[PDB]
Design a protein around this ligand. Structure first.
Ligand SMILES: CN1CN([C@@H]2O[C@H](COP(=O)(O)O)[C@@H](O)[C@H]2O)c2nc(N)[nH]c(=O)c21
Lengths: 138, 50, 751
């Protein structure tokens, strides 16, 4: 299957101001341009993770889908502590496909998570108690 | 503000607690005597489901 | 449709797009109580097991009036991301052929699928056995259902083939596989048939997961057991939504009873038929195990499957009851590869696997007071410089603290590393200095520098955050590759440090005693043992940076005094550290990307390195801990240990188709589950990286990566034979004799 539910195609519903700031139409520009990026994306937004959930807990859950190339934790800018979400960049899109399918709405740390498809992370996106004092504030 | 105080378990869990209760009720499963003796609020606290 | 921001509904399909729709759906038809009817309409004739909200677009599609599909059947494509069985592919092919000719059905598809395999209900049982084979012996027995129940046996025997085929075909999409399993279960044939269907589905999913993880190589990096656990949880959740319109609680009860039956069979070591002897009324289906559990299946359940399920259910289980009845099963009294483990061991393994997904407070709150001994056993935990590399690694730590992993650079790290080592007295002695070739001296000094670098890395990171560990390994990967360039697959000393009344080589003695150079025991202890056996270069002899660092940090893993029946004989601190090390520093760095944000990997960690690090960690603590002159004391220790082990081996040999529990065991791999997990995951990671590299556009760097990965695979098989896992005793036969793990690797079909 996955040949029958085409929802397997990576689609990201919301729109964001950096995409808004780029002067493109929300049709055939930001939405169409992102599809080529998302159609090759290996990255997922996790969502609803607790503030006290550690990277080991997120790794332990998402590593059963595939190798995690990079795991970026959301961080409140003022305190550099996890702010509720995360970004799990896998090695292959098979892992990201498994994470969105299998791990969406799945209990991670006594919190039901909202694994979705993202285009790719950047230090800017990582922002929005383990004090990540090693990450340069920005 | 303990980490367990901020744990609210999913509404599906009432099915699993009921399933555990039903599994123990038949096949003759009995808790440990000391565990049963935890009638002074010494038994395992259970997280609240919504 | 694909590559689109909006989903388009189904349209008229060409006969190509039909063969595929049929290949991935036609098999499911014979399993329900007419051709030309769409799956939603065919389910209406089965009592509409699934509500309209859960039905999918594909179930809406009706059959076309094409006679081209009739003639193009006279080889079908391959489903993505799964290792399809020869029976499953044959069954789906004959399903399409017999659905076209459709334009007793199940019994003829299974009989006709079997003939295809074995040319050029026992049938519905041999079908499941053929599905789970590279023959599989069924873990859970269907014949134990009651009196006058040939119909119920067939209903479950078909739910097992249906669940197997449904995870083989619908598995990547969990929601769709769960809706197809609910549809099969919730047929309205009879209320007593629902329990049999649920039992068949749960047992089939579990057995398929465990057989897939043993003999199926698909190179996807997705754990079959976690997927099975999430699928069974999704089944329960989806039966909950059907119920809010038999019961979600009942399916959950079979899932638990099937897990508890497996646990009790592991603890009892024999088919005690615990639920059969505890039946409430007899009419109810009670899961029984048809045989004991192989070590691989026990590792699957206690390390992946049950911990994942428990995480899904908030770590809540019938904990006190299970521990009590497992303890009763302990005081009791077969299959060659079957295993018995004590309750303490079983629940210790289960809770250490579970504790990685949570924290100590949650397990403390959940677990009753009867688990206090278990909790204390599963809960100095930090990595500390081993007083070797201490004064050299302090400078590196001061640099790392000052800059941080974000600011750490390879060249500045190299400068600080040389500035710190060269000062140290041992480096001055080695540099200044019966004969030492310049090649040996640069080898011994580069080895010390790399060991200092890795020890400083492990101490600074504490191996607690995978992001920091991965970023630091990525930054320092050129430095590590440059430092291990001279070392490579070569022994640090020119000649073996054991000669001949067997003694150590004079330059080796000089290094250990006068210069205070520390060689990890795996470099010389096996050769010493083999000399001592003779009295009455090896792959592990070749240098491994991670073996040295593991020995320095005291990562000693061993078995239990109770024998094989235990296994978790190791301190909690050392076991937690060896997980955080054999999983972050080795497994997650094997074939890992050169940069953050695939197919471009740095060779800091090799497969042979992981295997030899496990073997070093599994050396006896008597032979691994340094004494308190030192060299001869160590050698005498080795000699007396070898005499004792030879006596034990000869006793076992005269004590003896033959059960593996009755053969000589070193309690190294058959005892520690971290060893087996790491050894399997090495090959799994290599195959996954192979798939990613091949998927990348063809070129030259991809070709180099592919050759590197096949070299890693070949080196992995050779290093395992070096240990004895793939075969008067030999030193490897006395240090790492692991008949259960050896039997698994010799019959897994992956080496
Ligand atoms: C809700 N979000 C938030 N989010 C990302 O999270 C980052 C931080 O969002 P907040 O500032 O709301 O925490 C943003 O840069 C945004 O791209 C998301 N990214 C993806 N792909 N999908 C989603 O549903 C969401």
């Amino acid at each position: 299957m996955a040949e029958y539910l085409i929802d397997l195609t990576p689609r990201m519903a919301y729109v964001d101001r950096h995409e808004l700031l780029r002067s493109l139409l929300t049709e055939k520009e930001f939405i169409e341009r992102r599809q080529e990026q998302l159609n090759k994306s290996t990255t997922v937004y996790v969502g609803n993770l607790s503030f006290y959930t550690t990277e080991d807990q997120i790794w332990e859950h998402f590593s059963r889908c595939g190798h995690i190339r990079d795991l970026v934790m959301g961080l409140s800018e003022v305190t550099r502590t996890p702010c509720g979400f995360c970004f799990v960049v896998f090695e292959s899109q098979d892992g990201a496909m498994s994470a969105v399918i299998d791990l969406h709405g799945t209990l991670l740390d006594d919190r039901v998570i909202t694994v979705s498809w993202d285009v790719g992370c950047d230090h800017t996106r990582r922002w929005g108690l383990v004090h990540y004092t090693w990450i340069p504030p920005r | 503000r303990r980490r367990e105080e901020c744990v609210v378990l999913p509404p599906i869990m009432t099915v699993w607690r009921s399933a555990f209760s039903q599994y123990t009720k038949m096949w003759g499963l009995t808790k440990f005597a000391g565990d049963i003796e935890a009638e002074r609020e010494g038994e395992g606290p259970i997280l609240p489901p919504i | 449709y694909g590559s689109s921001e909006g989903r388009e509904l189904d349209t008229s399909y060409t006969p190509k797009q039909w063969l595929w729709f049929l290949y991935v759906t036609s098999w499911a038809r014979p399993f329900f109580t007419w051709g030309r009817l769409s799956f939603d309409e065919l389910l209406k004739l089965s009592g509409s097991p699934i509500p309209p909200a859960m039905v999918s677009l594909w179930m809406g599609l009706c059959m076309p009036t094409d006679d081209v599909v009739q003639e193009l059947r006279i080889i079908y494509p391959f489903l993505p991301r799964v290792a399809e069985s020869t029976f499953g592919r044959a069954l789906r092919s004959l399903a399409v052929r017999q659905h076209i000719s459709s334009w007793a059905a199940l019994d003829v598809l299974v009989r006709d699928t079997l003939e295809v395999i074995q040319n050029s209900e026992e049938a519905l049982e041999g079908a499941f056995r053929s599905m789970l084979s590279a023959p599989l012996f069924d873990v859970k027995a269907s014949i134990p259902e009651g009196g006058t129940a040939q119909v119920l046996i067939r209903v479950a025997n078909a739910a097992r083939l249906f669940a197997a085929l449904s995870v083989e075909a619908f598995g990547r999409v969990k929601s769709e596989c769960a809706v197809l399993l609910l549809a099969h279960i919730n047929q309205r044939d009879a209320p007593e048939h629902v329990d049999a269907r649920a039992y068949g589905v749960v047992t089939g999913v579990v057995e398929y997961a465990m057989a897939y993880r043993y003999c199926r190589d698909d190179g996807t990096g997705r754990c079959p057991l976690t997927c099975a656990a999430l699928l069974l949880h999704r089944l329960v959740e989806l039966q909950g939504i059907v119920e809010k319109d038999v019961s979600a609680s009942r399916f959950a009860n079979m899932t638990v009873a099937c897990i508890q039956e497996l646990l009790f069979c592991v603890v009892a070591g024999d088919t005690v038929r615990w639920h059969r002897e505890h039946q409430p009324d007899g009419v109810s289906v009670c899961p029984t195990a048809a045989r004991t559990l192989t070590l691989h299946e026990t590792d699957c359940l206690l390390q992946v499957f049950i911990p994942a399920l428990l995480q899904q259910v908030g770590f809540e289980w019938p904990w006190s009851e299970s521990l009590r009845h497992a303890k009763m099963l302990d005081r009791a009294r077969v299959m060659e590869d079957g295993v018995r483990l004590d309750s303490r061991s079983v629940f210790e393994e289960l809770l250490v696997s579970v504790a990685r997904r949570t924290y100590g407070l949650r397990l403390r709150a959940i677990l009753p007071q009867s688990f206090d001994v278990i909790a204390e056993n599963i809960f100095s935990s930090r990595f500390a410089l081993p007083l070797y590399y201490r004064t050299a690694g302090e400078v590196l730590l001061e640099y790392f603290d000052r800059c941080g992993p974000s600011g750490i650079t390879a060249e500045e790290t190299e400068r600080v590393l040389r500035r710190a080592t060269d000062v140290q007295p041992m480096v001055v002695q080695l540099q200044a200095l019966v004969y030492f070739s310049a090649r040996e001296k640069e080898r011994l000094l580069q080895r010390y520098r790399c060991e200092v670098l890795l020890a400083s890395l492990v101490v600074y990171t504490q191996l607690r955050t995978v992001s920091v560990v991965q970023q630091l390994t990525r930054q320092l990967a050129p430095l590590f590759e440059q430092l291990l360039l001279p070392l490579a697959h070569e022994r640090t000393l020119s000649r073996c440090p054991v000669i001949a009344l067997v003694d150590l080589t004079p330059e080796f003695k000089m290094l250990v005693d006068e210069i205070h150079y520390e060689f990890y025991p795996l470099e010389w202890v096996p050769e010493a043992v083999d000399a001592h056996i003779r009295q009455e270069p090896p792959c592990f002899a070749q240098y491994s940076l991670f073996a040295a660092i593991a020995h320095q940090f005291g990562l000693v893993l061993e078995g239990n005094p109770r024998g094989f029946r235990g296994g978790d004989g190791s301190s909690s601190e050392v076991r937690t550290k060896a997980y955080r090390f054999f999983t972050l520093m080795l497994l997650n760095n094997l074939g890992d990307a050169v940069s953050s944000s695939g197919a471009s990997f740095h060779s800091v960690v090799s497969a042979c390195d992981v295997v030899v690090t496990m073997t070093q960690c599994l050396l006896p603590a008597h032979l691994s801990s340094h004494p308190r002159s030192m060299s001869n004391e160590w050698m005498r220790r080795v000699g007396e240990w070898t005499r004792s082990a030879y006596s034990k081996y000869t006793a076992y040999q005269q004590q003896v188709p033959v059960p593996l529990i009755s053969l000589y065991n070193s309690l190294t791999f058959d005892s520690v589950p971290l060893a087996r997990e790491t050894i399997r995951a090495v090959r799994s990671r290599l195959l996954e990286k192979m798939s990613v590299v091949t998927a990348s556009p063809p070129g030259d760097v991809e070709t180099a990566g592919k050759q590197l990965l096949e070299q890693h695979l070949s080196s992995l098989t050779v290093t395992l034979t070096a240990v004895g896992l793939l075969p008067v005793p030999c030193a490897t036969q006395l240090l790492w004799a692991s008949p259960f793990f050896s039997h698994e690797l010799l019959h897994c079909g992956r080496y």
